[PDB]
């Protein structure tokens, strides 16, 4: 085996297309929260 | 060279308050 390979991404390609991926990883902890769903704080 | 650590190097295992308890 050799250290790197390159993708042959060509406009004519469907599973052989480039796919973008985002993984959102969530840090659920006993630390203070800093990334929160929009929900209004009451009194 | 070396030395004895005694009971050094304990740390809080998580950021949860606990009191009057053995964990």
Swiss-Prot record, chain A:
Changing residue 5 to R: In strain: Omicron/BA.1, Omicron/BA.2, Omicron/BA.2.12.1. Changing residue 5 to Y: Reduced host ACE2-binding affinity in vitro. Changing residue 8 to S: In strain: Omicron/BA.1. Changing residue 30 to P: Increased resistance to human covalescent sera neutralization. It comes from the Viruses. Residues 30-43 are annotated as: Disordered. Binds to host ACE2. RBD also interacts with the N-linked glycan on 'Asn-90' of ACE2. Cleavage of S generates a polybasic C-terminal sequence on S1 that binds to host Neuropilin-1 (NRP1) and Neuropilin-2 (NRP2) receptors. Interacts with host integrin alpha-5/beta-1 (ITGA5:ITGB1) and with ACE2 in complex with integrin alpha-5/beta-1 (ITGA5:ITGB1). May interact via cytoplasmic c-terminus with M protein. May interact (via N-terminus) with host bilirubin and biliverdin, thereby preventing antibody binding to the SARS-CoV-2 spike NTD via an allosteric mechanism. Attaches the virion to the cell membrane by interacting with host receptor, initiating the infection. The major receptor is host ACE2. When S2/S2' has been cleaved, binding to the receptor triggers direct fusion at the cell membrane. When S2/S2' has not been cleaved, binding to the receptor results in internalization of the virus by endocytosis using host TFRC and GRM2 and leading to fusion of the virion membrane with the host endosomal membrane. Alternatively, may use NRP1/NRP2 and integrin as entry receptors. This is Spike protein S1. It comes from Severe acute respiratory syndrome coronavirus 2 (2019-nCoV). The lineage of its organism: Viruses, Riboviria, Orthornavirae, Pisuviricota, Pisoniviricetes.
Curated annotation (Swiss-Prot), chain B:
Attaches the virion to the cell membrane by interacting with host receptor, initiating the infection. The major receptor is host ACE2. When S2/S2' has been cleaved, binding to the receptor triggers direct fusion at the cell membrane. When S2/S2' has not been cleaved, binding to the receptor results in internalization of the virus by endocytosis using host TFRC and GRM2 and leading to fusion of the virion membrane with the host endosomal membrane. Alternatively, may use NRP1/NRP2 and integrin as entry receptors. Binds to host ACE2. RBD also interacts with the N-linked glycan on 'Asn-90' of ACE2. Cleavage of S generates a polybasic C-terminal sequence on S1 that binds to host Neuropilin-1 (NRP1) and Neuropilin-2 (NRP2) receptors. Interacts with host integrin alpha-5/beta-1 (ITGA5:ITGB1) and with ACE2 in complex with integrin alpha-5/beta-1 (ITGA5:ITGB1). May interact via cytoplasmic c-terminus with M protein. May interact (via N-terminus) with host bilirubin and biliverdin, thereby preventing antibody binding to the SARS-CoV-2 spike NTD via an allosteric mechanism. This is Spike protein S1. The gene is S. The chain holds residues 27 to 49 of 1273 of the full protein.
């Amino acid at each position: 085996y050799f250290p790197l390979q390159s993708y042959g991404f060509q406009p004519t390609n469907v599973g052989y297309q480039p796919y973008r991926v985002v993984v959102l990883s969530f840090e659920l902890l006993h630390a203070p929260a800093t990334v929160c769903g929009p929900k209004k704080s009451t009194n | 060279a070396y030395t004895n650590s005694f009971t050094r190097g304990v740390y809080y295992p998580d950021k949860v308050f606990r009191s009057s308890v053995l964990h």
